[model samples]
Target: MAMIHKFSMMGTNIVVDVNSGAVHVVDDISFDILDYYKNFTAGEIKNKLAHKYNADEIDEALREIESLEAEGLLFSESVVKALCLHISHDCNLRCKYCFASTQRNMMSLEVGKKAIDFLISESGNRKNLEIDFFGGEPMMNFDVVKGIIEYARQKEKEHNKNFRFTLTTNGLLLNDENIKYINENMQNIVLSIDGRKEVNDRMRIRIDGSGCYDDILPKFKYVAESRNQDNYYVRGTFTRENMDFSNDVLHLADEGFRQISVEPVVAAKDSGYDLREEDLPRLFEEYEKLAYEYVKRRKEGNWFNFFHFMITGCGSGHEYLAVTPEGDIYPCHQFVGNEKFKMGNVKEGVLNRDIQNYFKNSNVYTKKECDSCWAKFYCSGGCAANSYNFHKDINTVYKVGCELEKKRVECALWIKAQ
Candidate 1:
């Protein structure tokens, strides 16, 4: 005999026995004929029999169930753990490939104050908080950024919480003043520098048709040479023209950058460039070589952090949420302005439950196309916004970036084996 626990689902109670792992379908079924006792511990065969189930095994199974429950895998109760706060929604420079869709947008101080209040209240006593300052260029609104930092710090002290900060910028606005504050207070800083001057100027130019490369590169060097070098990263977005030097990934590592992340550019609807299917494999090969060189250098005493490895197989998903200037919550930075994927309005409160449920129960993660795939764990079914935007279907599998995932996983496993 085994102790049984019953859980209700779909208006029915499903009874599971602890000892035998047997399931009872209906209340009418007698325990004697079910052969429910497949194994037994030495014990009295009466009322005491009910208590003989292994406590440790039962506890382990229950813990799994609880974890699933918390993730909203059961009846839906997923909560948010990370938030990307848009400190300044407008940029000082208008780069050609700017994703903010720059039309001189700015997040007002009132909105910032409202957002900070909502974030603290919605967090509901979460001990550890990760707030990333996003921007058209965060440095453009230095006052607002500083205010938000102070607000978060004050809230943390009041609530007795632990907090971490990160900022992503184009490096045009990071002068000595910005760098000084960042070095002292910020935990992470990601600067956007495509590559060498020519490569960077080709895509990342100002609206006046002037190249920003020469201007920003020196500032990049300033930050790169900081005593906090290990806390900084330089990222790039690759177009077909730059794919040939994708191996420059190693050059960046050699240049003393502790971490680097590059991904193919998402050509806008009117943009003339897009990565053709035929070119993907070549790009992957380039990335693979770069990753290999990075690992080689790291193993040989030239230490560096691989950004992709930091996330491992898991991506933003429920672990992170992006909040726009207007207070709409999105899944990540890429989907910030896209209206279709908005999770909830942050003006109301923290959307922990809504965000968690969206990530865990959405067709993007649970669809047969993704669930049956061999690389399900590593790819996480690709960016949900990309799937919906390009394919008009949330359940669609990511066909574009599979090769990149495969290469990264292979390299990571090889490095770990040592």
Candidate 2:
């Protein structure tokens, strides 16, 4: 089916095709005509809209849409294309919003080596592969982290593959010695810190129940500077308590962090901090405010990257998968502990054909609600794990997540217009 989305925003009528990645600033007549294009024949549409539009105008719109279809800009599927190694299942801090358990498990060097080999074999003809060092806190198992990297390097030459490594950590353990190693080896790093001290300390507390702001801020800053503020993200989470999360983003930007991603906290609705229906309007406005601020900062040459504003595909199951400490493979890191989502282990490769097929077949078109959605291509039907978590089905969309994503896309488009 040809899936295209049309809407009016910022006083301009816009039309976009999901598969072809085409956007147009169209007129009202064409917008309304497109609503019927997929279903109605030109003569039928002309007859129905004759009361509102002349036949010549309707014909012109029909011709234009037809031309775009011929050019494969109306409906054409795009190609898609990481391994996240959960090196440690234990974390230092006891973040309130954490999803993974703080089990005292770490990847043995043996299992880590198997993971690299599995990635190379599963990777097929792909020469460029990415390996992300993830964890409850990966640095807690720093030796294993280095070991896996070294093993991956050896495999890279043997298999004719290129490995781009990424590390995500809470900045508590980052120091001069480790920072030197990280900067030299890791392609990109994610330093976890939630905005300002008050916002951060409220949820991201140490196991000792004390704030880690004073501990992580300077270390995160040093890491950013060491890398010259490139190929890294100061990732944070915003909750119901912090509605004015834009300030936190700006605070990070002002603090000399150039790449940033402050995301909304995703938890069950019953959780006090989880986003509610009432909060959507305010949150939508906050996204707009942040987009405006983002553009202004760029114009002023104090540029920074906001992860949300960037366009990218979600390749959770097909192009990307996560490996747990015990060599089990999940669709992504978020699904690590969920046995149902466990595709297979490194030794056996992706042996769960049913689970593997589920992910392989899942895409934007598979979700019914996304058929009419504008942002479907951008989010790629959202996180399958999140959908499963909320709705117990990967094909279903999470209502709140859908709304926020659409709003972000709107804000991203609005920002691009600037």
Candidate 3:
């Protein structure tokens, strides 16, 4: 039997094989024929549509769609393993457009303890658990952080589980003492630096309003050089103002960091530095430049991180839990403070049925608009936060993100074609 799905794009029907990469821009007749496969045979389908369609072409399209059912594409529910503990809601740097709802509070050793217990217990039989030391800047509470890691280490042996840790930082508090600790302990690091002096200093700065590029460059350079290339990543954000952000990535490469992750800045509505409607064209142009450089570098075996290009996949928000300084829990880092998004806390362990139901429904099938999108499987209908903020609904996608995502996939495919 064939496993196939049909979606509308560009005013035409597309027949997609979920099992493989096979796709066809088909006619309405072919779409209708493929639609009722579980109900009827090709001969029966032809009989049903009799005289409304050409028999031979419909038969051909029908077989191709139905036979390709090896790995079916569908919505995902998660098995939890990853947890991001926002160690503190305090920071030394005040990034201009940071969405972090920080309150200058530190996560206590008690809340941190509850978080580990909750994570290990809630995680069930999963062998590996990933813990992230996230922040307003986690290093502010380094003692609490150090305590959790030690506690988690004991939990790992006692429970017969393995643990991997990661940390994301703005590169402000990396003194020699902590730098060595982070290098050896963190499985990987997300070191945030937006780019060169001018581009980065435009927005990212110390709370005192001093440029951070110089303050953090030596530390960034030291880690990228000393740590295993796989041990850390130089991660950054590109705002609407920095569409020509490819060189920033190249700059990191120049300093010897191989793995990098640069993402678009996320902010609430009408954020001063948010990517706007008019920014799309230049953004597209910039991505093309990055993509061009990316493939060229890869061929030359000097590739740097361009995080957007990735294999198709899906994960529900439930896979990861973000625990705030107050020990409150939300789905992920992007959805920290919203009352409606609260899944549960460290002590109670996901007690609310309502929020649990939302995570269950938070999949490609749950978003009606995603059913028609060609990039549906890859993006899983884009970010849930974007959906909620942009449209005032979590079940629908932000249209601009949809456009950008489709273009990115197109760009990747084009690179492969070359």
Candidate 4:
């Protein structure tokens, strides 16, 4: 049976996903038709909307909804599959635009063990549990990383939860042993090397004013070659300095990175290296070029980041538990310190009711701005971290990130149509 998952909100028909928090919009007639047709058909749908919409309009709307469904844009609910453990809150590099505070201590084995127990208990029937070793530099605490994994593995056998490990590195301490072990163990590895030397060296440099690009390049190549393509990707970020970053995509591809995701730096106002109003035009152009090449590459049997087009639903904070250095927990990675947003601890459990309820309440339907947005269902109302940075409200609708993200989503849908 073809299921119609949607509701009426702010004068438009909105389809909401509870799982991924993806949303979709349907016009008045299509909305009525969608509701009108259940165990439905295209011809039947057109007949149902005949009094309100034209024949062609009904057909087009049905086709669009079909595309949305095929892409998994509609959602009903969500599941907890991953938990991020901030093993270390300090890093070796002192990059200019770094957001993570390198002042805190590292998470102890006690906290990590409790976190594993939390994952096993909270994962429901989700056999696969994701644990990301994140940090100021997680590699700095490699022993804890290994320890947690071994602990989780033992828990896996006892609890029926399969732990999928992933490591994101700045390449400061990447070596043969770590690379081989991560590739063998992790589902995939995310390497943080932002494009070519000149591009990366601009902000991703050491406190001593030296670039780590050259140092990390060989280390990255060694991993890229040894690791499976599906098991790893090089992630980069673009700020206003590199508005024309399509070249960065080509650069990484040329440098032998097959799986890549070069993203826009999340900033509030002129969050240096952050994209701004003036940078949008250039950003759009680069994205279009990237999308174009992405299609070209895929046709040639190559796969790259398809984020040019955004998805209807996105993973929200409640789905993620950001375990901090001292075993403190936040909603997500962005809300690291703000005490009010702290949800719970590994030993004590989620302490704050506000934090617990915040995650459940965060969605397009809950945000006023999102109610009128066509992209609401697609973004599921941006992240709470994004909103808190700009509006002092975690659920505030995304205005800055939306500028480029909406455009990219449009371009991607257009490409898909073609």
- Give the winner by TM-score: 2
CA lDDT of every candidate: 0.62, 0.81, 0.73, 0.71
Q: Number of the top candidate by lDDT?
A: 2
Question: Any runs in candidate 2 off by more than 4 Å, and if so which?
Answer: 1-4, 7-13, 26-81, 267-269, 348-350
Where does candidate 4 stray beyond 4 Å? 1-80, 301-316
lDDT tens digits, residues 1-418, model 4?
A: 1233454422445554444445456577667665754468887777666777888977787776666666765422234567788988887787666676336678888889988887676677988788988968889898888899888888888887788888888998987787778877777788888787898998787767888898988888778778655677888887777777888888888777777787766534446666667677777777777767776777675556543453334454566778887777777776776777777777875446556666767777787776665555455357676677777887776566776776665555445543
Lowest lDDT sum, 10 consecutive residues, model 4, at 1-10
> Tens digits of per-residue lDDT for model 1 on 47-103?
232454454544444444445435433322133456777766767666555576544
Screening candidate 2 with a backbone cut-off below 3 angstroms (N, C-alpha, C), the clashing residue pairs are: none
Write down the worst ten-residue block by lDDT for model 3.
69-78
In terms of TM-score, how similar is model 4 to the real structure? 0.79
Cα lDDT for residue 140, model 2? 91
**What digit string (tens of lDDT, one per residue) describes model 3 on residues 70-133?**
2343211146787889998878777777875356899999999899888787788998998999
Better of 3 and 4 by TM-score: 3
Native-to-model Cα distance after best TM-score fit, residue 242 in candidate 2, in Å: 1.7
Stretches of candidate 1 above 4 Å error? 1-77, 266-270, 299-303, 309-319, 350-356, 363-365
Comparing 2 with 3 on lDDT, the higher-scoring candidate is: 2
Question: Which candidate model has the greater TM-score, 1 or 4?
Answer: 4
Give the per-residue Cα lDDT of candidate 4 at 134.
Answer: 90
lDDT of 2 by residue, 1-418 (tens): 5677776756677777877777777778888887788788988998889788999988998888788888888866511127889898888888887786335799898888888888887777888888899968899999988998998898888889899999999888888899999989999999999998999999888778898999999999988888888889999998888989999998999898999999876534556777877889988878878887887878676888899898744677667888888889887887776777877888776546667677777777777887777777677357676688777787888788778888888777666654
